[PDB]
Design a protein around this ligand. Sequence first.
Ligand SMILES: CCS/C(=N\c1ccc(CC)cc1)NC
Length: 435
Amino acid sequence: MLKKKQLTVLDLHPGAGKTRRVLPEIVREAIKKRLRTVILAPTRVVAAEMEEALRGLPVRYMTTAVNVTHSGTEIVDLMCHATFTSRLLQPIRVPNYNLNIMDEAHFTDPSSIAARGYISTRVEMGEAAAIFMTATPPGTRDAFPDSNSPIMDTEVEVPERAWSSGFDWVTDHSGKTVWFVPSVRNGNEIAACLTKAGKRVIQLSRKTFETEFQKTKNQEWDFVITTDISEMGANFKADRVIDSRRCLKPVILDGERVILAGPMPVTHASAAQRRGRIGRNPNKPGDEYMYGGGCAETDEGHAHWLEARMLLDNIYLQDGLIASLYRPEADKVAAIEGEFKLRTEQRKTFVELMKRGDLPVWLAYQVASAGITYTDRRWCFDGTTNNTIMEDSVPAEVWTKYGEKRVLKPRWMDARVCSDHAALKSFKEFAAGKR
Ligand SMILES: CCS/C(=N\c1ccc(CC)cc1)NC
């Protein structure tokens, strides 16, 4: 695997030992061969689990999720997928790693797709080797792969709202369940229904993941209600997965707005990953997987692939060349390579709106390409009446940095800035000039 050119896809089934068994062997060989190596973790939780599997080995942890006193002589760096992509975009020089290892290489967030694009392009140019570790490579059509122990698979109607009757099997269970819901708001309703029935529930989503995940180890629970973020290496000591088989899909309409379409079917890769949370202990056969819908290729036309192109167009590769998306996932978007390339100043605004502004990639691009500077928030208020953001059935209001009370009405509407209470609160703070 460890030779210039060559991208290897390590596709062992979920729980086969890619992270705890194969990864340390690869790292030992890389260090023996003096290969400058990067290990890409999807989340800070996976970064912490990787330190445990790699303990002793000289690895430089470029994350605050690990508390290690480095020696300065490490030739292996470990960082999150987003950090790698972020450093590539920023003026900081990123080493030209001879070996690029991506754990949970199926992650569909824009920064993970862009990282795959950049790395596979360097490999195609003959400059580096790469290893993509995932049980579900792009384009997988099997939602029921192998497991460490047999799983009972059952197609059943799964509630997506609070219920009074008709789903006794859900609450009659005496074990631990991980339940995948299509959104934070849908999970809040199911969590409330289960709590009212006497169950102890933990909720996980992208924003709360590190803090709330600790509770799955620190306390006794009956249910974990989670969004699709738990498909990325989140390990639970559970005996059942309930899977709605649904997700929200960001869709760019007329090149002018982003809506959260659906809920709609998950991909086969997402279903296999959700199911893959259980059946991991060869001594506990019979873990259950209850699923409530079929799979579909909902990654085609999904905004994340277009956002990945906006990122790759603004990353230096060599002269005017631009990194292409990883070949198996390149047809998911219809885009011209280079169409989102920004001049140095607008590029800096683009980066700062994502990094400091915490805006979605698509929204950051619309603001930066319009020649608007980072601190100029007049665009949050001068959109059409149909772009009015609503808070509890009434127009949302903020005090501008000037001291004026105004209705939140952005020139570009992206549904992700107000898809839950937390997102709308962060967007209100941005529109007010508070970051
Ligand atoms: C706070 C009261 S309004 C204010 N600025 C303006 C000025 C003009 C207009 C358009 C009539 C709106 C707003 N600053 C504090």
